Amino acid sequence: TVAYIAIGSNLASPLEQVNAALKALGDIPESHILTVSSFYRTPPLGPQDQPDYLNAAVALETSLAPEELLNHTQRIELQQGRVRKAERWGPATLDLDIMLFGNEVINTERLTVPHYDMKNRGFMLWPLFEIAPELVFPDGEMLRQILHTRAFDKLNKW
Numbered sequence: 001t002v003a004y005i006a007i008g009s010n011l012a013s014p015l016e017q018v019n020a021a022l023k024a025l026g027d028i029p030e031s032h033i034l035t036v037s038s039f040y041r042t043p044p045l046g047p048q049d050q051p052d053y054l055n056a057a058v059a060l061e062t063s064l065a066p067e068e069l070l071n072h073t074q075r076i077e078l079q080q081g082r083v084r085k086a087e088r089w090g091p092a093t094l095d096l097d098i099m100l101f102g103n104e105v106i107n108t109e110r111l112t113v114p115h116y117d118m119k120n121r122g123f124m125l126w127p128l129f130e131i132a133p134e135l136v137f138p139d140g141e142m143l144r145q146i147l148h149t150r151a152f153d154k155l156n157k158w
């Protein structure tokens, strides 16, 4: 199955973090990277006392179960120093979010797929569209169409 993973970093030299994350994603067992997006510099959504993000997306072919893939993305986050604080949508050395897991719909305590907010976020949809322009969401909507309709600002390269 192809999993689409959003990558964000706004602490501790985001370019180095995203390069490290890509290497580590490629080291996840029973998986392989298919496609990587460009790197974009995006203003923070949420609290404004934080740096701009590097945002990217990757397509990862995997035979892992979705929660097992999450275990591995979370491990990578911790290998790159991720800390979490009370404030919602605070900064991160590395944030790996599962946007889509094939065409699945997943509703569990640990995992909600499609990612709950991705359709509202150019910093997620634009990198996804670069690597999967023909993508169709589980609800039947086309990514390309959503982007044209919502008319989110185009992103700047990192």
Ligand SMILES: Nc1ncnc2c1ncn2[C@@H]1O[C@H](COP(=O)(O)CP(=O)(O)OP(=O)(O)O)[C@@H](O)[C@H]1O
Residues within 6 Å of the ligand: 070, 084, 089, 095, 096, 097, 098, 099, 109, 110, 111, 112, 113, 114, 115, 116, 117
């Ligand atoms: N699609 C998904 N991808 C990654 N985590 C998901 C997820 N759906 C639910 N999670 C859960 O989200 C929990 C908190 O992860 P965080 O990384 O702190 C949220 P965040 O990425 O900072 O905000 P965001 O989800 O609004 O982008 C994880 O412990 C995980 O169980």
Ligand SMILES: Nc1nc2c(c(=O)[nH]1)N=C(CO)CN2
Residues within 6 Å of the ligand: 007, 008, 009, 042, 043, 044, 045, 046, 053, 055, 089, 090, 095, 123
């Ligand atoms: N620009 C940008 N803003 C964000 C991002 C992100 O990836 N990019 N992630 C958040 C929570 O994970 C909160 N805010």
Ligand SMILES: [Cl-]
Residues within 6 Å of the ligand: 114, 137, 138, 139, 140
């Ligand atoms: Cl959907």
Ligand SMILES: [Mg+2]
Residues within 6 Å of the ligand: 095, 096, 097
């Ligand atoms: Mg996250």
Ligand SMILES: [Mg+2]
Residues within 6 Å of the ligand: 008, 095, 097
């Ligand atoms: Mg996130």
